[PDB]
């Protein structure tokens, strides 16, 4: 649970938005193909 | 903390400069904090301590002078000001804590952490004298600024969210491999 | 090359408001703690002076045994033969060391990690005069940092051998 | 190393806790191994030499306090001491060495290594005058946290195989570019 | 803020096992190595002790010299005048220094180092009295430490002047 | 810097060796610019000094002693040295700063910086009664492999090139989307 | 193991171009600076040397003096009662202390810093012998540089406590 | 020969082996296209 | 501009050109769609 845990405290940043962002299409993609 | 004996530079102009800057940025007085092997951050300590004495003992005169003896060790290092002293005997040039050069880069604007200016013969040494040092302060610059940004890259991107994107490029060609 | 990029710029302290921290004026043999100063006058002639004594130097005029105790441990010991005279004295503030034969080296090697170019000379006196209004020209803390450290350190050194 | 004078903390109880734990892990303790500028370690290293000082001088009880005299920079940071000295002769806060805070994350679990709790005019600073370098340590925690993550990552993980990786994945593009 | 999720909590070490390292319990004005005890006491009557022979202080109980030998060295150049007494004895251990009013400066300075509210009068006198059984309570290295940093680096200024 | 007295090893032949090898390269006496804990480059130091001596002060032989009372922590690390003189007066295992060993790997070629061959009894230590040390420094060279070729990396590489790296793969994978 | 791979080399210094540092051969009890050395013998038998005159030493034969400074600052404050005798001389070059029972404390005290398996026994002379050719074996600096730590740091308690 | 090299002292991390295990199935996937 | 300004100081060393020539491929594949 330390994964969830430590997100909260620095999402502020605009760098880990935009990865985040990033992973989230890559999943999108993957439902495209199933 | 560098500034450990004020507690509650650019307000009290400690830094003359003859460049028509005026001060520092917060972020080039912080490069001193874990830095005991350079003259400048040396003296702002000492400049700390005096504010730090003006302040909490404006009563007696006798006792500001009277606490640096066997104390020197704590607001500055023994290492360097023996350093000098040593060095200065043997003729070896020396620093005098007096001029400190960095390098103010134009373009990018980052600047180095200001080292001694050496003297030898009761004369500043020669510009000619030290670039190898000024070269490498400036490879230093660049390679330090690339760190540096790593290392807060680091300190503020969750490294677990790194490993999942990591997995996420895997599936992702894992689902285009069909 | 790298360096062509970069530009040189000079950094100087402001020596002027280090008020706690004695500082030492070379240019003007000069030690000044906030605006109290002692200078060091190689003077040619003997001064009547009174021998030094040095609890009511204290009683009197804090100010010049402050400034001066250090210089006078890292003289270390005096010899008995050579006179040491205090003014004891408000106003006229002079502690007047005699550079006898025997007294030359330690002196020296005082004056010398104080003030490099002040060269002492046998048959004459130091002078230390106190001055609470002086404003000495070149005033930086190393010297007087460099004296704290070798008192601390050299102690032994500057002590008789019997 | 951390225990340079005992050679071949929990289990001798060095440390007194009211909150109910009774050890800290080895991980905390070995947060000193470099760390000259913390009381905390300084008193660490002074329990190791009392330590090795009661193992190999059991015989003597003279030598055990005749060899401190002008070696007690071999054990603790004589900088610390000053400056403590320096600062409770001049009316600052200063660490006495007693009371040491440390943040524990109760959720996270990870805590801070325990600094001074400053004491000045002969009581214990208020929390309320500290509670700047209490964020600052709160701030520091997540920081060196996620440094410290990527610094075992690097310890551990071939570089070579992740340049590897990102070979892997150009040529995954040229693959699928087809 | 950040600070709401986090806790403070308290970490103190346990002195109780530092026998090697003499420690300094202020609230006994007690120096405490081991078992050993020295209590420094402000005596307002004269003991009938004789002159301090270390030596013989020496030959005869080591843990007592051991004990205020650093202490001593704090204040220094004691003054002739000033009564050193020592007990000389094995069971009735009392080192008793007189705080005349030349000697009362340096004595004070070393106090002050030690047991910083231990306020030393003149006319008085101050009785280390040795201790093989007294738990003192409060001991924490801390000021002997200071004391023997103090020693190494500022014995100069703790000497006489002339 | 590391040789801060000699100003304008390997030629002077400072460092004799059993196994053959002449002289160290540059990087591994470079190991040792901010080692102050290590009495290898502590007896750097002295040699760098005692060059510098001979040049500088070859007239008076007098001066060239003389100028040594109070002035080592400017040469050499106190801390070691008064380390040294406790170990040895307690009788635990001391650093002598006669001996040195360092872990030559054969293959992958790299070598460890030189530690210290503690001295007990008169009589060198056995390897078995420090072989946890080999143990730890063996790991050490693994783990500070790692880390230095990932500093370097980092002070060579442009962050803002490994963003745009990431944005690529993103916008790749945006693409490949359609 | 790990350890298996890797190969365990030894380093050695080359201590025989440290001609500036002074070098102690604890192996035949020698402190040699560049070509010259002070060799420290236990002799049994009384010398017919006059007083040491530290002034006339340092005048007539500088590279003595600069050699056993050290260690006489190490001995500290020399029985007046025992005898220190200094030969004066450009070729016979000999400065022997009595090891009475009240000087071998000190003496002891200061051989254990420089030569440890040297034991002075009371009835005796230490002897430094100046050797201006002679090459002492085993020469490290180390020992030198413990001495002048101790110098530094604890030049207090080896001075007289009245 | 250095890469080859390294491979067996750290092999036992998970996160090495899931690694070496992804470059695997790429060749794989290569080797499906010829 | 600070990305742009970094590159001429340091595209000597071969990693960065590497990257660099990945990145250029990667946008000719986008105009290829395109
Ligand atoms: C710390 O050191 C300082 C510096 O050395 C000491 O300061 C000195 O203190 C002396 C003792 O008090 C003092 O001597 C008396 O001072 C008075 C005059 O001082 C002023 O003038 C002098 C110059 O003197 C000339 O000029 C004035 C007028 O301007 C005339 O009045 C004088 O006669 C002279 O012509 C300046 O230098 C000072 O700065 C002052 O401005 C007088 O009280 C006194 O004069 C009497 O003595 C003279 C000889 O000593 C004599 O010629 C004169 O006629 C006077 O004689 C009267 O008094 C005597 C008793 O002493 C009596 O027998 C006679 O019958 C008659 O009534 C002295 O001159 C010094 O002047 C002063 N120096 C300086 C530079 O300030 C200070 O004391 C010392 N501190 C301590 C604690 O010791
Ligand atoms: C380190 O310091 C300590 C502390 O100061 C020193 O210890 C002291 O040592 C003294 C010398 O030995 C000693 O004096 C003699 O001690 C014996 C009695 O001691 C016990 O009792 C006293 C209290 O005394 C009273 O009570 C007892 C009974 O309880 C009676 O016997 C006494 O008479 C008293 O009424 C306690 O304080 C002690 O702790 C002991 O328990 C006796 O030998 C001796 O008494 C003789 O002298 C008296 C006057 O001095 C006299 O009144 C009495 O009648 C005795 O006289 C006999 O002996 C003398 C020769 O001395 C002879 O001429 C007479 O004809 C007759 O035969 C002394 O009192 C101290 O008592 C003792 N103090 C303490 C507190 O322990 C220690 O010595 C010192 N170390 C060194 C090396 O100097
Ligand atoms: C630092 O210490 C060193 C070491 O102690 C001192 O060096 C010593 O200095 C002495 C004073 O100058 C010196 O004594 C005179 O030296 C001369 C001979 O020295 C050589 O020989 C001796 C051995 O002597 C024997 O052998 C030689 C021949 O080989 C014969 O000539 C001798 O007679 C002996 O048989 C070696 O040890 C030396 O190394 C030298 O090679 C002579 O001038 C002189 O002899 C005279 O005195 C003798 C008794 O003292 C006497 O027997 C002899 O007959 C001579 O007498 C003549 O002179 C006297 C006046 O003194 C006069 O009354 C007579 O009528 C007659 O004319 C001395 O022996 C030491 O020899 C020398 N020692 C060493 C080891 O070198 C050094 O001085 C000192 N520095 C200072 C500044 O004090
Ligand atoms: C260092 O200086 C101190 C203090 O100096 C004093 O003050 C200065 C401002 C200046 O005025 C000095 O001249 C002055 O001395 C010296 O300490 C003083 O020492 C003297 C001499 O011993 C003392 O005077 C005596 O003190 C006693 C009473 O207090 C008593 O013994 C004496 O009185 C008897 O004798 C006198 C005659 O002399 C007689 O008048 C009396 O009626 C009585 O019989 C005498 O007064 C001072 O009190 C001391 N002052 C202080 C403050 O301690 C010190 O001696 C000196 N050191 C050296 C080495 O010379
Ligand atoms: C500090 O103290 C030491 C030791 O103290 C001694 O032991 C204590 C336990 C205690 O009993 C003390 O009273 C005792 O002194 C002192 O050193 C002693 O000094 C004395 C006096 O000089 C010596 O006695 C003499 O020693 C010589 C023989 O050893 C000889 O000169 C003398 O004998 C001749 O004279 C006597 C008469 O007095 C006569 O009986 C003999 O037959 C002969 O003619 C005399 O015995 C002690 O031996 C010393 N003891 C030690 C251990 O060194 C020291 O003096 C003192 N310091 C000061 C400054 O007072
Ligand atoms: C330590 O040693 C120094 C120097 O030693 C000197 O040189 C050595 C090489 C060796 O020869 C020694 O014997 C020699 O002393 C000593 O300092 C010397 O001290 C003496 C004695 O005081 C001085 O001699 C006197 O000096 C004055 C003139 O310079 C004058 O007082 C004397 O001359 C009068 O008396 C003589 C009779 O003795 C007579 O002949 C004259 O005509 C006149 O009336 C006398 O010459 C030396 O000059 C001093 N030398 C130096 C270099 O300072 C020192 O005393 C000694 N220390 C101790 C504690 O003993
Ligand atoms: C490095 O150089 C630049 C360019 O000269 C400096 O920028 C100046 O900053 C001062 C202080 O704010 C301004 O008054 C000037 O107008 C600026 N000059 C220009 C041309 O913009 C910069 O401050 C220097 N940096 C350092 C640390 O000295
Ligand atoms: C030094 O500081 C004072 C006080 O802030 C200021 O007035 C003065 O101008 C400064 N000196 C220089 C040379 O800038
Ligand atoms: C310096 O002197 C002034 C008065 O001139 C005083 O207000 C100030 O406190 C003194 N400073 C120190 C550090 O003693
Ligand atoms: C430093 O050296 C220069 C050489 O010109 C001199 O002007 C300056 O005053 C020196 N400072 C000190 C503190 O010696
Ligand atoms: C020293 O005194 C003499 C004699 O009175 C005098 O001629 C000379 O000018 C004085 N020297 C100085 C420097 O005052
Ligand atoms: C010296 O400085 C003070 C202030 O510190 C000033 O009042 C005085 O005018 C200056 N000049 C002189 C000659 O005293
Ligand atoms: C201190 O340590 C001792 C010995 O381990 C232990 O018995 C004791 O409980 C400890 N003290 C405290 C207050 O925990
Ligand atoms: C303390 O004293 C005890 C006996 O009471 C002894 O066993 C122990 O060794 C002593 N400790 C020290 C450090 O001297
Ligand atoms: C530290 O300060 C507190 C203030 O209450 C006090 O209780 C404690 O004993 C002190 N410790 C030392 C070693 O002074
Ligand atoms: C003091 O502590 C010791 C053990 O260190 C114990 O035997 C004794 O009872 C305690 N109390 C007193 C009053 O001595
Ligand atoms: C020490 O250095 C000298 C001078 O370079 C050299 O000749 C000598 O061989 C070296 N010693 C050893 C044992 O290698
Ligand atoms: C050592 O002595 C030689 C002559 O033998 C001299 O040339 C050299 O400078 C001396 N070295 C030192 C460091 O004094
Ligand atoms: C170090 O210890 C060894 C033990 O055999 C010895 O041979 C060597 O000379 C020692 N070096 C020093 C400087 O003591
Ligand atoms: C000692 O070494 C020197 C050179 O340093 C050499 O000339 C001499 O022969 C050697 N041997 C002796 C016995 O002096
Ligand atoms: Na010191």
Known sequence: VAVFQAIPEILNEAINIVIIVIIMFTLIKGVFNL | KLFQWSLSHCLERWLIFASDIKCFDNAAIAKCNKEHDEE???????????????????????????????????????TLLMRSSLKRLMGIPYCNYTKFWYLNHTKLGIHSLPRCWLVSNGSYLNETKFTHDMEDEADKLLTEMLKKEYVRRQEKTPITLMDILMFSVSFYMFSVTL | ?????????????????????????????????????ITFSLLTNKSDLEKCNF????????????????????????????????????????????????????????????????????????????????????????????????????????????
């Open chain 2, 40 to 78: 400048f951050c040396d003296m702002l300590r000492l400049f700390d301590y005096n504010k730090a004495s003006i302040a909490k003992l404006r009563g007696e005169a006798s006792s500001s002078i009277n606490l640096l003896s066997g104390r020197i060790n704590a607001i500055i290092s023994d």
């Open chain 3, 1 to 37: 090359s790298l360096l062509s990029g970069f530009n040189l710029e000079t950094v100087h302290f402001n020596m002027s408001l280090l008020s706690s921290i004695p500082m030492v004026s070379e240019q003007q043999h000069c030690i000044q703690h906030n605006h109290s100063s």
């Open chain 3, 55 to 162: 609890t009511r130097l204290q009683a009197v005029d804090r100010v010049i045994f402050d400034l001066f105790r250090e210089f006078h441990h890292r003289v270390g010991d005096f010899p008995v033969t050579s006179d040491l005279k205090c003014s004891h004295n408000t106003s006229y503030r002079v502690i007047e060391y005699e550079v006898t034969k025997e007294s030359l080296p330690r002196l020296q090697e005082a004056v010398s990690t104080l003030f490099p170019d002040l060269h002492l000379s046998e048959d004459r006196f130091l002078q230390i005069q106190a001055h609470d209004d002086k404003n000495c020209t070149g005033l930086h803390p190393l010297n007087y940092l460099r004296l704290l450290k070798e008192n601390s350190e050299t102690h032994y050194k500057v002590r008789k051998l019997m």
